[model samples]
Target: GKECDCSSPENPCCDAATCKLRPGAQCGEGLCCEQCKFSRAGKICRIPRGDMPDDRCTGQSADCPRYH
Candidate 1:
């Protein structure tokens, strides 16, 4: 099952109800978090996913700098 914490502002990844992730929730796993949503593009959300030979490879999707 999915889980999210609603305590700390650093990990405000969940709503005030249960321990599930919020709908369209954005936070807790990025270099830029604003108000309650993840920051805009160009921000490092995390290390990129998939197998890349170069470390400079960047994820261009506005969703996040990286994906889980």
Candidate 2:
């Protein structure tokens, strides 16, 4: 399956099944919305509880790295 390539040190958008939130970044997710909705377009990705793109916080408080 296609996954978000966040290996590079850049403003990585979780453009995969899911994305990981950068450390210290505020994370917030939406309910009933598509998983990809987290990383829709912009960097304000409100990703749900799934595969993390970064090692910040677990299914808890994270950066609102929404791609919308």
Candidate 3:
């Protein structure tokens, strides 16, 4: 498989939910650390707030950062 560049603030790679797998990590749903936000270590996506929506990725399409 191709390696994903998940080190930048831009082109933030989606976790297991959106992407099939995380680089050097396991795959699973709700396994992300923060919601609507990508993990710093690339293990999973992160949920920003407790009251936030269930969507792993949030905000408007324009608000979403570009994914490499």
Candidate 4:
């Protein structure tokens, strides 16, 4: 079967099958963004978590390198 290419640095995919970064996973940069009502504005992937503002994914943001 043809699997998704997820090793690219610009669009690295998470290894975890259920992770939001995996191929076809519900992520702001991947599959989810297509159906998601929100949009990615900055250098980060901000997907709103129910009731709260967009929950920022550290790995998907520029600030992650500085803090982690």
Top candidate (TM-score): 1
Most lDDT-accurate candidate: 1
Clashing pairs in 3: 34-46, 34-47, 35-46, 35-47, 35-48
Tens digits of per-residue lDDT for model 3, 1-68: 24432322332344433443344433222234233333443231334557654333332221223221
Model 3's lDDT to the true fold?
0.33
Tens-digit lDDT string for candidate 1 (1-68) = 24454444335465545554565765434344544465554544555458743222133332433332
The all-Cα superposition gives candidate 4 an RMSD in Å to the true structure of 10.5
lDDT of each residue in 1-68, candidate 4, tens digit only: 13433333345444434233545444334322433222333323444556755433244432223211
Q: Is candidate 1 or candidate 2 better by lDDT?
A: 1
Q: Estimate every model's Cα lDDT from 0 to 1.
A: 0.45, 0.33, 0.33, 0.37
Clashing pairs in 1: none
- Number of backbone clashes in candidate 3: 5
- Residues 10-58, candidate 2, lDDT per residue (tens digit)? 4343323345443443322332122323333333333445774522222
Where is model 4 more than 4 Å wrong at Cα? 6-44, 47-50, 60-68
The TM-scores, one per candidate, come to 0.29, 0.16, 0.17, 0.21
In TM-score terms, candidate 1 sits at 0.29
How many backbone clashes does every candidate have?
0, 19, 5, 0
